[model samples]
Target chain A: YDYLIKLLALGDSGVGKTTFLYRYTDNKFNPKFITTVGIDFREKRVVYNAKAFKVHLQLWDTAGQERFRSLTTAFFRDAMGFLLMFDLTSQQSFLNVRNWMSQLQANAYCENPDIVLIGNKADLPDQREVNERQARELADKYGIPYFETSAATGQNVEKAVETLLDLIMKRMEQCV
Target chain B: DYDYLIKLLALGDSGVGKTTFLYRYTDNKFNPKFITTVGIDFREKRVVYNAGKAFKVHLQLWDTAGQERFRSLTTAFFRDAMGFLLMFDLTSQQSFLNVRNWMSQLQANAYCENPDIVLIGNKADLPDQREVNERQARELADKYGIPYFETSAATGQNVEKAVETLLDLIMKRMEQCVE
Candidate 1:
């Protein structure tokens, strides 16, 4: 692998953080509702930029339970990019996106690290608590792209992660 | 068999509340805990199925893990199930999509080509988050030629009705098998 990119997912409990990465890395949506214990990771190889760059993606799945915060946020400094996710059906999860953003800024490798704002569980429209307009506004305020994703249907999982990876790649080029 | 033993199974995607659904059915109480099933487990309940000509029905409801890794182990149990409570999370479109896959599993591994099964949409209390609409689910169930119910293990909504319906289906089949 020529490039090793580490990305982490963060959100409140039951926000589909683990499932999103599972869908991205494994290309399968697991219906298992088990909460992540603390931290687990999956690895995958992808070609980036059409140059056939062998990018090794170390995708970290983090527990959203408050008890794991101290441990999970400590990992923030290591990841190159982040999947800042929230459950579309839970207003509380969406509300805490700001809190997660604050945590990322305070602890991430850079103040403005590569991040893709993800509203997960997009497959459920009737139960949607966070509309795209509000989510788009938030992402716009942060000057980052937003995505409505369904880890269940494998929808936008690739686009969101790839977008973050592209951003990180751009930053890497600029730094060199 | 003694007590007219009957075996049933609940299969669905992870976190769709299979454990809680069975818990509500057996205990008539709710456990909001989201502890994932390791591979497979079951709960036993005795219900007077078919009140008209009531019989002591010993219900053994098997609950399978919804994770992909457990797919092999879980599907193997499908052969033993007399009836199935095929469930999905109403809030997750993925769970609903996987229902087709589960149906295929039953067709291949079940004792017969088509076993007694009921389609269930769990977490109905969270109407605000429901992804699978009643009509959408009904259409799929109807296509499979099975019964469908929207249930909430948390509120005990349609929990009993769903199970009894499956038992009735199984009981009728058992009668046919005996005849």
Candidate 2:
């Protein structure tokens, strides 16, 4: 049986979560999609190491509403990897990445500590608020892999997923 | 005359619609400059009720930077918050997915009074390639126990209603507390 990797895409509401998914799944880009309400899930199959691996990308697009914050603990169980995203142009989103990390550590299954910190919206270089060095430093501090991706221009979007897969595979190997 | 202070926060990932929601509520305009929020910005407005009773709403909008390092700063501002506007872009699924993480942080830092919260599905004007559907949003809102509104900051649709509804919920909660 092929291993099914259950990954969760987590970040603030509107940091290009859906766009990234569509870009990855469909390879079509549209800039004017509306806000995601709660959680959106999708699946994709990839050939990793000459074996068919099913990538069940459960993209948990969070409603930016504070009321739903309590309800998130239910989804944190048994997540293999998490994509912590933030917009490049929005400094506030970049700064809130730590909150996501802390929340994951507190609520998610601590046994699997694989997470990929994604600095989304790399296409908007002109409007970039958080710098690359700052993101890199934070990733190093938190001991996670970081990538700057633009779902709009398809920059590093695939690499983000690929890197996550690599990390998951390595972790699984280490467990053996 | 007593002043009613309501701290409304915009908690979400960057590029969701925090700034746009604020601009729509305050000035009824949407500026797509894509500027990132540094820490937090606030605006105060006095609203009058139907009976000519006025309440000052000290809207404390915390625009948390959507990066990994700044999440710790939320502890400083998460106290005594009456209402929260959890916004998500319909098109951006990733931002929507992170709602759980944001909520977890709030549960840890916020008051346990079941804070009045609203789920705002912003960018309603965009009709092409809608990633998140209205039914999906409504279902999520129901599942998570919150009110949901589909709004367009560009067209000024339901923008005011969202703010007003939040204030109304807050007032109701206060009344219940006094009782």
Candidate 3:
């Protein structure tokens, strides 16, 4: 038997949710967006410990369109973890994190969902508007793990997923 | 006269590649990490028409953040768009389902006898895993009284056809207004 988990992608569009999932699932990037429509669930099974306890992670991509707010909000409780993303080059996406987080708190099934706050497009150093400290400070304020990843170049993509899975693993243990 | 500056919008669920497809139509190139938008932004183009005296129709593409948080824009903002290029991901059925909501918002706010519209299903390249069927999408387009197409922003498939055909329809509406 294996432990199964569902993780949802939350945040603005074009902020690399699809790209990151593609990268994590297949080590490939579809420069053109692959719709994270509800039907597609990217998954990976890994042995997490010496005992080879199998944990299967299913990644869910929600429709970010406001029209589907109630539909997506209803599904928030179905997830055990979340990947909150924003474009490092966009400051608005950064500010919107609080909005997503508040939405998450209200809709999530548990007191706290395992979160990985991501600043994507990390390759665009020159175009980066949101500074390093601000993201980290925000993470501190929320007490969540932070990562800057580049789905384009495969930078820290796996590490962030692994970190989120680790948190989910610990979270499930507490629930048990 | 430089004909109407028609403002068109691409509506769909998030990660539906609206920006990539918009960039492909306007720039003829697919950008990997170009997110030059937040709440709202646009790309401009000038289309020509007629053989005797060419009319340069300037097109202003108004893109919205599709997500609910940015609904803060005054309802008047959407009241200005002339027409629309409504898109949904061929791979996502939920995107197809939500298309009705976007159209309702447009009809409710956009002041027009009948809004000029086009329904495009992007990500046609994903033939193997396509969730939304072509015939059904066409039926939806027919019901909405708009042109429809299956396009792939990544491979630039029908990217031009979807955009040009919508512009052609909008031009017809402008001609009627001028007369």
Candidate 4:
């Protein structure tokens, strides 16, 4: 039995973490899941290239509120991959992505090499505050794969997960 | 010239409709200031009764920054709050799941007060995108002994009713404290 690959979803609050999880896990979309207080976990089994694997995705949906910062840090232990997400509608969340990035870099860099930076809420193009060019440039600077996804419409949602899984698989193969 | 006594805290992740709820109930206006909360803010208001009685409701609305560094500040407010509002977007499961830690923080900090808590499911207008069902939220509310309200801050749905219910609960607790 192959061990589960632990992928962590993280970002500022209300960045579509739960929506992304539901879309990927159940192919269902929900838009009103409120701010995650601490951490949430969901599991999914996937078959890629004829091999079955379990992706036990633990989403650390940190509270976007400053008061819950210490609470969120406790959940950061032993994470394998991070889906660093931000809302395209809120520039503050977009700007705060660096804070999330830095915290992970300082704390979990040694444990996980596969980090996929995600910009969620791609469906609300009218409400977008962060430019795609700028987001891509930041991802390039950080040396991580970037994706714009809409968890609501399932737009590029599966592809984003597949890309992240592929990256994680590559890292695991190289380690072996 | 009376000062606000009980500090009512509203906490949740960003875009969970905190601002909308605040505006809908307090001022009946909607401004799309969807920016992440930085530090905190407070406002005061009074609730009047028809029976020649009035309670000076000083609604101290604290909007905490929704980033990691600001997480440390939660302890400060938890120290003096009389009640807490734990809000989540009904369509987002991640927020609902994270309620555990939020509850834990309250338990760790303000258990003595046993502060009155309410689990709020905001954004009820978007039924098609609902991730958290009413039953699950109700179960959590029952487990924690907290009241639950499903409100759409966008449509002013249950916004005032929820606030009034929470205020009444707080007033009842205050009566108990006085006795």
lDDT of each: 0.64, 0.61, 0.63, 0.61
| RMSD of candidates 1 onward, in order | 25.4, 24.1, 23.5, 25.0
DockQ of all models, two decimals each: 0.01, 0.02, 0.02, 0.02
Model 3: how far residue B38 lies from native, Å: 19
Q: Which is the winner by TM-score between candidate 1 and candidate 2?
A: 2
**Docking model 3 quality class:** incorrect
Candidate 3 vs 4: which has more lDDT: 3
Writing each residue's lDDT as its tens digit, candidate 3 over A91-156 gives 999989866676553533345677889999999999999988989988887788999999998998
Docking model 4 quality class = incorrect
- Look at candidate 2 and tell me the lDDT of residue A45: 22
Give the alpha carbon lDDT tens digit for every residue of B9-124 in model 2: 66667677776667556652322221222222111212221215333322111122233222433443455566778888888877777775565455433333777889998888
Docking class of 1: incorrect
Off by over 4 Å in 3: A27-77, A102-111, B1-179
Question: Which sections of candidate 1 miss by over 4 Å?
Answer: A1-176, B28-76, B104-113
Off by over 4 Å in 4: A1-176, B1-4, B28-73, B108-112
Per lDDT, the best of the predicted structures is: 1
Docking level of model 2: incorrect
DockQ of 4: 0.02
